[PDB]
Amino acid sequence: RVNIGEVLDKRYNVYGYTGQGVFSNVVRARDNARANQEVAVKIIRNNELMQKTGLKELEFLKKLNDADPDDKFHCLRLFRHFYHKQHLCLVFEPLSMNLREVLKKYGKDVGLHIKAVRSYSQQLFLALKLLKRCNILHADIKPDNILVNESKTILKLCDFGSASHVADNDITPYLVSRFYRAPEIIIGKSYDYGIDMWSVGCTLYELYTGKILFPGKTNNHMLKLAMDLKGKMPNKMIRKGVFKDQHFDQNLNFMYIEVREKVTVMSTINPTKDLLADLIGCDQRKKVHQLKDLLDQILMLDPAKRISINQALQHAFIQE
Amino acid sequence: RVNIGEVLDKRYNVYGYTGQGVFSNVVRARDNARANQEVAVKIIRNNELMQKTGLKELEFLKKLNDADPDDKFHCLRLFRHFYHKQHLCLVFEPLSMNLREVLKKYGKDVGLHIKAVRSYSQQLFLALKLLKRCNILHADIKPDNILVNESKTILKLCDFGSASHVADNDITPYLVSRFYRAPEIIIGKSYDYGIDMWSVGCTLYELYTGKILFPGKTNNHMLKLAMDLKGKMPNKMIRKGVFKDQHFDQNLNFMYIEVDREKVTVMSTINPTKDLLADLILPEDQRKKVHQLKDLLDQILMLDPAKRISINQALQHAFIQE
């Protein structure tokens, strides 16, 4: 809703857009008060509840920035905030583009160089470590919410409008964006940092292949695709889920919805999905193997068997 | 103190020895009351202090067996106990030999197959898991206290005569047999389940190479051997140590003691000379496993237990997951 050339807060001169995505306009400005240095300004919706979550996003970045004084854990750095025409405005460090758009600039299904993915994975885990340390769930990790500097060497985890503290975790199967939504959310089993880990694993595969790992059209389709990888969901797990019903029968069989309407029943699924295959189309192969193995250890259906952050950080794929 | 022939408790015919494990002789018997099924009877030593830890022993085994009904977690199964000529007697499921003896039947520095080692690794971590779930430290894990069945497919962690609760952590620099003793014990830092995981690491290496990992002649030598692997101990950690003064100077430099008359040499930095992969060494399937073992060992052998790999994480490690 803002115009180019507009000066905001008597210092920020808006010279362009990063875009409307998707709950707030983010603009590029130069800051008169600081030698015309570049900033991003996120302008939150004119909106009764959009601003509630904007004030949320403010607090989470404070704690996260307070907790990372030397900024070494790769979360977006918030500078300050103000109000303009009844909009809360957040001022961030300037960052060129998100990984969604770098991936598009790489072309249909191409992916990033394995060097890049390797470096990015380490930065994302450092980010997961900083989050857990603060007892925060980011709860929407994917390429679209990861930003990078102009040189594309440093990434930052951004958009904390979905974030929450670990404790208040509501029981909704629609937490996190679908493609990156972990099985313990869908099923209704209690969850924590592991969902952020699951999401990272989802986007690492996407960073390297250029493809969405689990393009499920619904929660049922998601669980299906997950179990096409790790076989069926563990039984003790299936049972702890407040929504297990919606997805399994008392014989703990998976009820898979189809096309008109169909509802097949499966007692076991049997892994169909070849990660290592997908991670290649046509010493370099060395690392791709490691990455596959890394993806295998973080995409475990039971959160409790999922690789820890420090072990991820310590994994062979990272250590080169 | 027993005679082959001697029947114990009106039911156990003692027919052979496994021996004087250490603090008590252990013999093989058949149980008349059960169609002569095989048992081991452990006879604790007269001493009033020794039978005091025998009660302790009985206690931890009952707890551990109690908390593991299906026996999924690889601790020695106690059947029952009686008394005999004033000795406490523990009756265990019968078990062939320890890993100390199987290692010797393999020959000098030969070690076991990597298949067996990874199988044993999982079983050992499973035992570590039960111990933590019962808030017990074992505190003497090493090949000698790990028994195995006839076919050597299965092992059991045994000899809970050094075990303790986690809460009453006596600051002694001599918990655990020296070669398997973690640096936090020696430095006098506060310690917990981490010391059993360290011990497991040492015996996995020793299980595969046939070699003792840290054959240190003194506590000070052990620290030296451990920093050869990992580098100098973290300052953050050296400070938390009640016995830091024995090993590190005011500047936190390691003081390495040697004989011939005792000389001391100070090292400010100590850079890793120990090459784990090259020790610890056939085909690419195996070789890949051995690299995995080497990666797993490196997480286990972190000088600071705070950084040391957890049990659940160890169980999920690639080396285990096959």
XYZ file of C-alpha atoms in Angstrom:
642
model
C 0.000 0.000 0.000
C 3.091 2.265 -0.016
C 4.544 4.443 -2.786
C 8.103 4.784 -4.086
C 9.924 7.902 -2.970
C 7.856 8.034 0.196
C 9.826 8.903 3.307
C 8.904 6.889 6.368
C 9.533 7.891 9.979
C 11.317 10.992 8.658
C 14.373 8.986 7.538
C 13.579 5.889 5.461
C 13.167 6.682 1.796
C 11.424 3.896 -0.060
C 12.949 3.138 -3.447
C 11.502 -0.279 -4.217
C 9.788 -3.542 -3.323
C 10.888 -6.999 -2.331
C 7.211 -7.853 -2.596
C 3.771 -8.448 -1.136
C 4.362 -11.718 0.685
C 1.955 -12.399 1.965
C 0.652 -10.577 5.015
C 2.762 -7.450 4.827
C 4.484 -5.329 2.209
C 8.278 -5.355 2.480
C 10.131 -2.435 0.890
C 13.727 -1.422 0.268
C 14.616 2.003 1.661
C 17.672 4.106 2.309
C 18.068 5.668 5.748
C 18.754 9.416 5.623
C 19.818 9.315 9.269
C 22.510 6.756 8.531
C 24.437 7.857 5.449
C 21.645 6.460 3.265
C 22.374 2.860 4.242
C 19.994 0.180 2.953
C 17.263 -1.322 5.102
C 14.214 -3.484 4.630
C 10.952 -2.281 6.131
C 8.181 -4.770 6.704
C 4.806 -3.054 6.854
C 2.235 -5.148 8.732
C -1.391 -5.380 7.586
C -3.869 -2.629 8.497
C -5.360 -5.377 10.446
C -6.781 -6.287 13.841
C -5.056 -9.666 14.220
C -2.256 -9.206 11.697
C -0.795 -6.594 14.029
C -1.177 -8.886 17.024
C 1.186 -11.309 15.284
C 3.403 -8.440 14.157
C 3.942 -7.389 17.769
C 4.624 -11.081 18.325
C 7.237 -11.041 15.579
C 8.826 -8.035 17.272
C 9.234 -9.744 20.636
C 10.636 -12.953 19.196
C 13.289 -11.113 17.191
C 14.284 -9.056 20.253
C 14.852 -12.151 22.399
C 16.547 -13.856 19.449
C 18.719 -10.852 18.651
C 19.366 -10.181 22.350
C 20.410 -13.813 22.704
C 22.744 -13.603 19.688
C 24.748 -10.383 20.335
C 27.550 -11.279 17.938
C 24.974 -12.581 15.448
C 26.434 -16.005 14.689
C 23.231 -18.077 14.589
C 21.725 -16.791 11.376
C 18.427 -15.258 12.338
C 17.197 -12.086 10.702
C 18.543 -9.026 12.526
C 15.913 -6.511 13.575
C 17.079 -2.885 13.832
C 14.055 -1.037 15.230
C 10.363 -0.254 14.674
C 7.914 2.640 14.332
C 4.381 3.488 13.199
C 3.204 4.892 9.893
C -0.448 5.541 9.044
C -1.502 3.041 11.731
C 0.803 0.300 10.454
C 3.410 -1.310 12.661
C 6.673 -1.073 10.735
C 9.673 -3.300 11.389
C 13.138 -2.333 10.179
C 15.490 -5.161 9.257
C 18.995 -5.555 7.921
C 18.805 -5.406 4.090
C 18.839 -8.811 2.377
C 18.693 -9.339 -1.384
C 16.464 -12.350 -2.017
C 14.864 -15.414 -0.499
C 15.969 -18.949 -1.377
C 12.717 -19.622 -3.169
C 13.698 -17.036 -5.756
C 17.328 -18.097 -5.988
C 16.047 -21.625 -6.688
C 13.873 -20.274 -9.529
C 16.845 -18.357 -10.932
C 18.544 -21.752 -11.164
C 15.890 -23.219 -13.464
C 13.410 -26.103 -13.612
C 14.428 -28.791 -11.142
C 18.106 -27.860 -11.165
C 18.936 -27.111 -7.524
C 21.937 -25.483 -5.882
C 25.521 -26.712 -6.042
C 26.257 -29.285 -3.331
C 28.894 -26.890 -1.975
C 26.156 -24.335 -1.415
C 23.666 -26.770 0.096
C 26.389 -28.037 2.416
C 27.177 -24.547 3.661
C 23.483 -23.644 3.927
C 22.650 -26.753 5.982
C 25.225 -25.756 8.599
C 23.792 -22.245 8.808
C 20.248 -23.566 9.164
C 21.286 -25.896 12.011
C 23.037 -23.046 13.822
C 19.692 -21.284 13.435
C 17.868 -24.270 14.908
C 20.275 -24.275 17.849
C 19.651 -20.560 18.523
C 15.891 -21.150 18.358
C 15.852 -24.108 20.738
C 18.114 -22.235 23.149
C 15.426 -19.538 23.261
C 12.628 -22.118 23.464
C 11.112 -20.911 20.202
C 9.438 -22.793 17.381
C 9.690 -20.928 14.089
C 7.021 -23.199 12.653
C 7.304 -22.060 9.042
C 10.738 -22.999 7.761
C 10.975 -23.289 3.968
C 12.877 -21.597 1.120
C 10.465 -18.648 1.008
C 11.319 -17.628 4.560
C 15.071 -17.942 4.212
C 16.945 -14.860 3.018
C 20.462 -14.428 1.760
C 22.966 -11.599 1.283
C 23.925 -10.184 -2.113
C 26.953 -12.491 -2.332
C 24.596 -15.391 -1.539
C 27.070 -16.748 1.006
C 25.213 -15.925 4.224
C 21.605 -16.949 4.892
C 19.164 -15.707 7.499
C 16.009 -17.303 8.828
C 13.225 -14.770 8.671
C 9.484 -14.150 9.097
C 8.644 -15.037 12.674
C 4.934 -14.333 12.339
C 4.041 -17.997 12.937
C 6.526 -18.536 15.750
C 5.467 -19.636 19.227
C 6.950 -20.654 22.550
C 7.393 -24.388 22.955
C 4.911 -24.591 25.823
C 1.720 -23.090 24.416
C 1.773 -25.526 21.500
C -1.833 -25.650 20.315
C -3.290 -28.860 18.950
C -3.976 -27.939 15.334
C -3.022 -30.243 12.423
C -2.428 -27.165 10.266
C 0.697 -25.791 11.944
C 3.563 -25.126 9.487
C 3.001 -24.906 5.705
C 1.719 -28.219 4.353
C 4.701 -29.327 2.302
C 6.984 -28.739 5.281
C 4.541 -29.897 7.951
C 5.866 -32.731 10.114
C 3.879 -35.939 10.856
C 3.522 -35.262 14.590
C 1.593 -32.096 13.771
C -0.725 -33.820 11.309
C -1.415 -36.765 13.595
C -2.008 -34.608 16.664
C 0.855 -36.003 18.725
C 2.599 -33.432 20.935
C 5.531 -31.743 19.239
C 8.486 -29.405 19.726
C 11.746 -28.309 18.067
C 11.615 -31.427 15.926
C 9.070 -29.836 13.571
C 11.663 -27.172 12.729
C 14.177 -29.948 12.136
C 11.718 -31.780 9.882
C 11.121 -28.567 7.890
C 14.879 -27.982 7.444
C 15.201 -31.507 6.102
C 12.385 -30.780 3.722
C 14.038 -27.673 2.403
C 17.549 -29.135 2.207
C 16.227 -31.721 -0.242
C 14.523 -28.881 -2.092
C 17.681 -26.747 -2.121
C 19.648 -29.527 -3.774
C 17.057 -30.974 -6.152
C 14.911 -27.955 -6.897
C 11.869 -30.136 -6.129
C 9.339 -30.135 -3.296
C 9.926 -33.324 -1.283
C 6.343 -33.921 -0.099
C 3.909 -32.088 -2.436
C 0.920 -33.553 -0.621
C -2.459 -32.123 -1.516
C -3.861 -32.749 1.964
C -2.733 -33.954 5.387
C -3.672 -37.506 4.402
C -1.631 -37.209 1.217
C 1.288 -35.855 3.274
C 1.370 -38.735 5.757
C 1.151 -41.050 2.766
C 4.212 -39.544 1.062
C 6.134 -39.591 4.326
C 5.387 -43.289 4.725
C 6.474 -43.834 1.131
C 9.902 -43.003 2.536
C 10.150 -44.509 6.023
C 7.448 -47.131 5.623
C 4.454 -46.972 7.935
C 4.265 -44.769 11.026
C 5.366 -46.386 14.316
C 2.528 -47.842 16.377
C 3.279 -46.242 19.741
C 3.329 -43.008 17.753
C 0.124 -43.613 15.788
C -1.560 -44.144 19.141
C -0.416 -40.954 20.887
C -2.047 -38.857 18.183
C -5.187 -36.897 19.022
C -6.118 -37.244 15.342
C -4.935 -40.838 14.807
C -8.614 -41.595 14.150
C -8.771 -39.259 11.161
C -5.995 -41.306 9.542
C -5.878 -44.853 10.919
C -8.323 -47.561 11.989
C -8.094 -49.453 15.289
C -6.104 -52.156 13.499
C -3.637 -49.267 13.253
C -3.960 -49.439 9.481
C -3.411 -46.359 7.350
C -6.552 -45.206 5.561
C -5.437 -43.562 2.286
C -7.894 -41.291 0.480
C -8.011 -41.319 -3.320
C -9.519 -39.716 -6.431
C -14.806 -40.556 -7.887
C -14.110 -41.069 -4.175
C -11.967 -43.955 -2.889
C -10.586 -44.968 0.518
C -8.060 -47.795 0.359
C -6.708 -49.404 3.543
C -3.047 -50.288 4.090
C -1.552 -52.479 6.794
C 1.961 -51.586 5.724
C 3.148 -49.166 3.036
C 6.686 -50.310 2.237
C 9.162 -47.577 1.305
C 8.734 -46.607 -2.339
C 10.768 -43.418 -2.333
C 14.398 -43.448 -3.424
C 15.949 -40.317 -1.926
C 19.421 -41.002 -3.249
C 17.922 -41.480 -6.692
C 16.120 -38.132 -6.607
C 19.243 -36.482 -5.207
C 20.773 -37.294 -8.584
C 19.538 -36.976 -12.125
C 22.685 -37.199 -14.219
C 34.033 -36.929 -4.579
C 31.071 -34.845 -5.705
C 28.962 -38.010 -5.596
C 30.632 -38.531 -2.223
C 28.793 -35.636 -0.598
C 25.483 -36.378 -2.296
C 25.616 -39.749 -0.576
C 26.295 -38.068 2.771
C 23.414 -35.663 2.188
C 21.031 -38.531 1.489
C 22.156 -40.221 4.676
C 21.726 -36.903 6.492
C 18.198 -36.561 5.093
C 17.530 -40.112 6.232
C 18.466 -39.311 9.803
C 16.416 -36.157 10.105
C 13.317 -37.334 8.233
C 12.371 -39.955 10.818
C 8.624 -40.078 11.503
C 8.952 -40.402 15.279
C 10.349 -37.060 16.461
C 12.280 -38.814 19.226
C 14.459 -40.741 16.761
C 15.228 -37.587 14.789
C 18.839 -36.419 14.694
C 19.721 -33.803 17.310
C 20.926 -30.363 16.289
C 24.492 -30.882 17.504
C 24.691 -34.263 15.795
C 23.358 -32.674 12.611
C 26.005 -29.972 12.992
C 28.528 -32.736 13.589
C 27.311 -34.986 10.747
C 29.639 -36.130 7.957
C 27.875 -34.016 5.325
C 28.694 -30.834 7.239
C 32.201 -31.757 8.307
C 33.142 -32.230 4.635
C 35.805 -71.142 49.073
C 33.527 -73.818 47.556
C 33.904 -77.461 46.525
C 32.655 -78.913 43.262
C 29.954 -81.287 44.451
C 28.785 -79.033 47.267
C 25.064 -78.405 46.845
C 23.912 -74.933 47.809
C 20.532 -73.905 49.215
C 19.314 -77.516 48.931
C 19.009 -77.111 45.156
C 22.181 -75.910 43.400
C 24.793 -78.506 42.526
C 28.065 -76.610 42.018
C 30.006 -78.354 39.260
C 32.545 -75.857 37.922
C 34.097 -72.401 38.258
C 33.947 -69.400 36.036
C 36.204 -68.050 38.764
C 37.041 -65.260 41.212
C 35.772 -62.463 38.973
C 37.212 -60.032 41.537
C 35.213 -59.379 44.701
C 33.534 -62.769 44.892
C 33.881 -66.183 43.301
C 31.340 -67.251 40.675
C 30.546 -70.902 39.994
C 28.386 -72.908 37.615
C 25.633 -75.112 39.061
C 22.590 -77.098 38.003
C 19.253 -76.464 39.704
C 17.794 -79.757 40.985
C 14.487 -78.029 41.569
C 14.291 -77.070 37.909
C 15.320 -80.152 35.938
C 18.960 -79.186 36.417
C 18.768 -75.984 34.394
C 22.117 -74.157 34.285
C 22.752 -71.204 36.590
C 25.588 -69.046 37.748
C 25.906 -68.520 41.483
C 27.862 -65.508 42.638
C 29.145 -65.807 46.169
C 29.956 -62.430 47.713
C 32.990 -62.208 50.008
C 32.776 -62.528 53.798
C 33.813 -58.924 54.504
C 31.187 -56.651 56.067
C 32.028 -53.883 53.593
C 31.892 -56.143 50.528
C 28.569 -57.758 51.396
C 27.416 -54.167 51.908
C 27.759 -53.568 48.152
C 26.363 -57.034 47.517
C 23.126 -55.794 49.059
C 23.648 -52.778 46.837
C 24.302 -55.110 43.931
C 21.125 -57.125 44.609
C 19.274 -53.844 44.864
C 20.280 -52.408 41.487
C 19.725 -55.677 39.650
C 16.228 -56.037 41.117
C 15.459 -52.466 40.092
C 16.957 -52.938 36.617
C 15.322 -56.317 36.010
C 12.119 -54.882 37.512
C 12.107 -52.024 35.030
C 12.877 -54.335 32.104
C 10.257 -57.133 32.130
C 10.772 -58.251 28.538
C 14.560 -58.153 28.900
C 14.981 -55.833 25.918
C 17.803 -53.864 27.500
C 20.641 -56.304 27.984
C 21.360 -56.389 31.678
C 22.252 -59.588 33.511
C 19.051 -61.271 34.703
C 18.998 -62.118 38.397
C 16.882 -65.160 39.292
C 17.002 -65.009 43.082
C 19.254 -64.921 46.134
C 19.796 -66.980 49.277
C 22.394 -67.127 52.069
C 25.126 -69.656 52.659
C 27.656 -69.920 55.478
C 27.168 -66.175 55.901
C 27.779 -65.259 52.252
C 25.122 -63.557 50.158
C 24.631 -65.655 47.032
C 23.206 -64.260 43.791
C 21.762 -66.624 41.195
C 21.994 -65.454 37.583
C 20.976 -66.758 34.190
C 23.973 -68.832 32.968
C 26.445 -67.030 30.709
C 29.376 -68.267 28.678
C 32.253 -65.784 28.924
C 33.085 -62.088 29.022
C 34.314 -60.027 26.071
C 37.749 -59.951 27.681
C 38.038 -63.690 27.044
C 36.457 -63.675 23.590
C 38.870 -60.941 22.605
C 41.776 -63.162 23.630
C 40.513 -66.130 21.615
C 40.700 -63.903 18.559
C 44.440 -63.202 18.866
C 46.837 -60.243 19.211
C 45.263 -57.021 17.958
C 42.855 -58.866 15.695
C 39.613 -57.666 17.241
C 36.157 -58.868 16.222
C 34.389 -58.481 12.906
C 32.825 -55.056 12.410
C 29.455 -56.850 12.129
C 29.800 -58.209 15.633
C 31.115 -54.905 16.968
C 28.147 -52.960 15.636
C 25.781 -55.566 16.980
C 27.447 -55.294 20.399
C 27.424 -51.501 20.136
C 23.663 -51.396 19.849
C 23.227 -53.811 22.720
C 25.598 -51.773 24.889
C 23.761 -48.517 24.174
C 20.524 -50.292 25.039
C 21.991 -51.143 28.446
C 23.133 -47.536 28.865
C 19.539 -46.526 28.172
C 18.113 -48.776 30.924
C 20.732 -47.510 33.399
C 19.810 -43.848 32.813
C 16.098 -44.661 32.983
C 16.762 -46.104 36.452
C 19.128 -43.316 37.470
C 21.979 -45.796 37.931
C 25.662 -45.372 37.092
C 27.390 -48.675 36.398
C 30.905 -47.270 36.670
C 32.874 -50.304 35.586
C 31.875 -51.035 32.004
C 34.684 -52.731 30.047
C 35.091 -56.029 28.195
C 35.591 -57.920 31.481
C 32.161 -57.076 32.853
C 30.298 -57.756 29.645
C 29.121 -61.321 29.210
C 27.902 -63.106 26.163
C 25.963 -66.294 25.407
C 27.043 -69.627 23.931
C 26.702 -68.338 20.367
C 27.933 -64.858 21.223
C 24.947 -63.252 19.534
C 23.774 -61.692 22.804
C 25.585 -59.769 25.513
C 24.680 -58.707 28.997
C 26.115 -55.907 31.075
C 27.009 -57.315 34.459
C 28.834 -56.872 37.750
C 26.887 -54.064 39.363
C 29.175 -54.060 42.370
C 30.602 -50.614 41.552
C 27.276 -49.068 40.636
C 25.867 -46.049 42.435
C 22.944 -43.656 42.285
C 23.493 -40.485 40.257
C 22.656 -38.176 43.160
C 25.342 -39.207 45.663
C 28.376 -38.484 43.499
C 31.489 -39.069 45.617
C 34.268 -36.860 44.310
C 37.014 -39.454 43.901
C 39.510 -39.464 41.002
C 39.411 -43.281 40.997
C 35.880 -44.218 40.048
C 36.013 -46.691 37.124
C 38.932 -48.907 36.096
C 41.588 -46.437 34.913
C 41.704 -47.263 31.168
C 37.957 -46.713 30.936
C 37.858 -43.711 33.285
C 36.419 -40.479 31.843
C 38.308 -37.170 32.115
C 35.587 -35.623 34.289
C 36.325 -38.222 36.960
C 40.043 -37.494 36.804
C 39.680 -33.714 36.656
C 37.191 -33.919 39.518
C 34.374 -32.352 37.536
C 30.816 -33.355 38.422
C 29.819 -36.458 36.497
C 26.749 -38.470 35.585
C 25.660 -41.049 33.008
C 28.306 -39.606 30.711
C 30.995 -41.700 32.369
C 29.357 -44.953 31.299
C 29.076 -43.705 27.725
C 32.796 -42.796 27.789
C 33.585 -46.286 29.065
C 31.505 -47.824 26.280
C 33.454 -45.822 23.706
C 36.749 -47.102 25.059
C 35.581 -50.722 24.906
C 34.107 -50.418 21.373
C 37.516 -49.293 20.113
C 39.112 -52.113 22.131
C 36.454 -54.463 20.815
C 37.386 -53.760 17.200
C 41.150 -53.299 17.431
C 41.892 -55.805 20.165
C 43.835 -52.934 21.750
C 43.340 -50.888 24.909
C 42.555 -47.327 23.758
C 44.028 -45.444 26.703
C 46.615 -47.621 28.448
C 47.629 -44.864 30.870
C 49.869 -45.764 33.832
C 48.425 -42.953 36.001
C 45.537 -40.510 35.991
C 47.887 -37.852 34.603
C 48.956 -40.171 31.772
C 45.303 -40.918 30.913
C 44.615 -37.211 30.508
C 47.687 -36.990 28.303
C 46.491 -39.919 26.178
C 42.983 -38.412 25.884
C 44.254 -34.989 24.748
C 46.464 -36.727 22.185
C 43.124 -37.680 20.640
C 40.952 -34.629 21.237
C 43.432 -31.846 21.906
C 43.742 -29.786 25.087
C 40.841 -29.900 27.534
C 38.464 -26.887 27.464
C 39.351 -24.181 30.011
C 35.679 -23.912 30.867
C 36.011 -27.551 31.910
C 39.425 -27.444 33.599
C 38.053 -24.843 35.993
C 35.046 -26.920 37.050
C 37.528 -29.532 38.210
C 38.118 -30.188 41.894
C 41.492 -31.777 41.111
C 42.566 -29.425 38.332
C 45.600 -28.410 40.415
C 47.109 -31.884 40.059
C 47.259 -31.640 36.253
C 46.989 -28.017 35.107
C 49.048 -25.011 36.168
C 47.792 -21.533 37.072
C 47.798 -20.658 33.344
C 45.742 -23.792 32.625
C 48.679 -25.420 30.851
C 48.773 -29.195 31.090
C 51.509 -30.479 33.384
C 52.720 -33.818 32.068
C 54.537 -35.985 34.577
C 57.326 -38.348 33.560
C 59.854 -40.543 35.355
C 63.655 -40.458 35.201
C 62.991 -39.169 39.464
C 59.775 -37.399 38.445
C 60.113 -34.613 35.871
C 57.299 -32.276 34.791
C 56.929 -30.769 31.343
C 54.369 -28.068 30.669
C 52.458 -27.857 27.404
C 50.423 -24.729 26.654
C 48.830 -26.198 23.573
C 48.500 -29.885 22.778
C 47.580 -30.746 19.204
C 46.045 -34.127 18.313
C 48.605 -36.735 17.273
C 46.298 -39.739 17.688
C 44.852 -40.846 14.353
C 41.724 -42.840 15.138
C 40.832 -44.021 11.630
C 44.335 -45.364 11.008
C 44.249 -47.243 14.246
C 40.982 -49.120 14.014
C 42.362 -50.546 10.746
C 39.362 -55.214 3.535
C 36.203 -54.250 1.561
C 34.267 -51.037 0.912
C 31.162 -52.213 2.769
C 33.284 -52.852 5.870
C 35.558 -49.860 5.362
C 32.494 -47.631 5.244
C 31.298 -49.156 8.531
C 34.682 -48.613 10.147
C 34.588 -44.953 9.090
C 31.210 -44.833 10.756
C 32.632 -46.366 13.921
C 35.356 -43.751 13.813
C 32.743 -40.983 13.506
C 30.659 -42.477 16.323
C 33.730 -42.836 18.525
C 34.547 -39.191 18.000
C 31.155 -38.057 19.312
C 31.500 -40.422 22.302
C 35.045 -39.442 23.228
C 34.413 -35.713 23.595
C 36.464 -34.622 26.612
C 33.565 -32.523 27.930
C 30.593 -34.792 28.688
C 28.298 -31.829 28.047
C 29.281 -32.128 24.374
C 29.201 -35.915 24.435
C 26.680 -37.745 22.236
C 23.479 -38.837 24.007
C 22.313 -42.437 24.259
C 19.275 -42.005 22.013
C 21.439 -40.193 19.471
C 24.057 -42.930 19.647
C 21.351 -45.563 19.032
C 20.295 -43.600 15.966
C 23.847 -43.142 14.636
C 24.559 -44.374 11.100
C 27.046 -46.895 12.416
C 24.221 -48.615 14.323
C 21.401 -48.070 11.832
C 23.508 -50.329 9.594
